[PDB]
């Protein structure tokens, strides 16, 4: 069939947070983290 490995999506590293949209991942580390070296 087709069903098998689900996911094929990247997630934030610093934290274990899962998003729905691609942009959400960006806007996330944008402020939620904003970790300045
Ligand atoms: Zn994060």
Q: Which descriptors apply to this entry?
A:
37 residues, Zinc finger protein ZFAT, monomeric, 0% strand, elongated, zfat, metal binding protein, 1 helix, mainly alpha, binds zinc ion
3D structure, described in words:
The PDB classes it as metal binding protein. The entry lists the keywords zfat, metal binding protein. It forms a monomeric assembly. The entry is titled "Solution structures of the DNA-binding domains of immune-related zinc-finger protein ZFAT". 32% of the residues lie in helices and 0% in strands. The protein is mainly α and 37 residues long. The radius of gyration is 13 Å and the shape is elongated. The termini are far apart. The structure holds zinc ion (ZN).
Instruction: List the secondary-structure elements in sequence, H or E.
Output: H
Rg measurement, Å: 13 Å
Strand content: under 5%
Bound molecules: zinc ion
The number of strands is 0
Shape from CA axes? elongated
Q: Given the structure, what is the number of helices? A: 1
Proportion of helical residues: 25-40%
Euclidean distance between termini CA atoms: 48 Å
The major pleated sheet works out as: none
Summed up, the domain count is 1
The helix/strand class is mainly alpha
PDB class: metal binding protein
Keywords: zfat, metal binding protein
Assembly: monomeric
Entry title: Solution structures of the DNA-binding domains of immune-related zinc-finger protein ZFAT
């Amino acid at each position: 069939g087709s069903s098998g490995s689900s996911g094929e999506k990247f997630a934030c590293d610093y934290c274990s947070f899962t998003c729905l949209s691609k942009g959400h991942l960006k806007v996330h580390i944008e402020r939620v983290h904003k970790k300045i070296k």
